[PDB]
Amino acid sequence: GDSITMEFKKDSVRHSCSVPYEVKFNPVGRELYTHPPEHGVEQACQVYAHDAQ
Amino acid sequence: ECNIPGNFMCSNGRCIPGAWQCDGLPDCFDKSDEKECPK
Amino acid sequence: STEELFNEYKLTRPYMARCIRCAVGSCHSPIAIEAVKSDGHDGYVRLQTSSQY
Amino acid sequence: NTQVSKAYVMKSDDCLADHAEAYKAHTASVQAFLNITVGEHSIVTTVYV
Ligand SMILES: *[C@@H]1O[C@H](CO)[C@@H](O)[C@H](O)[C@H]1NC(C)=O
Ligand SMILES: [Ca+2]
């Protein structure tokens, strides 16, 4: 997408905020996909760990 | 493997946040993240 | 009324299948879509899911 | 451990209505519809060429 919008419901009218930032993730490998396939081969990549460590 | 590292492997092989390991919620859906949890 | 509405549903039962992404990673969920057809000219989609309703 | 995978190709369920038909044609004949009036005799004639 072209921008990121975040929102949550308060005890009243819902609040939202949009900030301009270029979001464009490079597909892993020499094949340009939009979503990961059901099946494929395992290749090395660099990703954000969710671990709080 | 999964989002290395932190992904505690469940009994069914699903990956959960390591902050949800032993947090009192059934995130694996088989209770394996909440079993054997140390005190 | 008629077996088309009575349906073989009584014999079948919904089932589960693997999705590529279930939000945070893959999972064996009944929502899994087996196939999608897009031959209609009016823009309607015919999705075949692993569950029944 | 052994995991056997099997797959095959089958016609789509939509093919019955949405399909192309390949024909071969030759030796064409022409059929014409002439309005012929001969001496105040108006008729509608369907006749080949
Ligand atoms: C010729 O054909 C048209 C319609 O096919 C008809 O209305 C008309 O009366 C005909 N004319 C003569 C002279 O037969
Ligand atoms: Ca948990």
Side-chain angles (χ1 to χ4, degrees), chain C residues 37 39 41 46, chain D residues 12-14 18:
Chain C
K37 305 295 182 185
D39 297 310
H41 293 96
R46 189 181 73 194
Chain D
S12 173
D13 289 349
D14 294 313
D18 185 357

Side-chain angles (χ1 to χ4, degrees), chain A residues 11-31:
Chain A
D11 294 347
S12 59
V13 174
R14 294 180 179 176
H15 178 67
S16 65
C17 169
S18 295
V19 298
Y21 186 80
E22 183 180 358
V23 179
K24 184 178 180 179
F25 292 101
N26 190 335
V28 182
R30 292 190 297 274
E31 297 178 55

Side-chain angles (χ1 to χ4, degrees), chain A residues 48-51, chain B residues 1-10 14-18 21, chain C residues 24:
Chain A
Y48 291 118
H50 65 230
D51 193 356
Chain B
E1 185 177 1
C2 264
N3 193 30
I4 295 295
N7 291 252
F8 167 68
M9 191 175 296
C10 304
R14 280 172 69 263
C15 304
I16 58 160
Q21 183 179 358
Chain C
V24 186

Side-chain angles (χ1 to χ4, degrees), chain D residues 33-38 40-44:
Chain D
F33 298 83
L34 274 58
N35 187 340
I36 299 172
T37 300
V38 179
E40 299 181 357
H41 294 88
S42 295
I43 59 173
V44 179

Side-chain angles (χ1 to χ4, degrees), chain C residues 2-21:
Chain C
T2 305
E3 291 177 357
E4 291 176 356
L5 295 178
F6 290 164
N7 195 341
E8 66 275 8
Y9 167 89
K10 292 181 179 181
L11 180 59
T12 57
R13 187 184 67 171
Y15 65 91
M16 295 178 285
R18 181 180 291 274
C19 275
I20 296 169
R21 294 293 182 272

Side-chain angles (χ1 to χ4, degrees), chain C residues 22-34:
Chain C
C22 296
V24 186
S26 66
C27 76
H28 296 286
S29 170
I31 197 171
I33 301 170
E34 190 65 49

Side-chain angles (χ1 to χ4, degrees), chain D residues 21-39:
Chain D
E21 300 180 305
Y23 299 99
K24 292 182 181 181
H26 60 72
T27 307
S29 297
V30 180
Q31 182 185 76
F33 298 83
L34 274 58
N35 187 340
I36 299 172
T37 300
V38 179

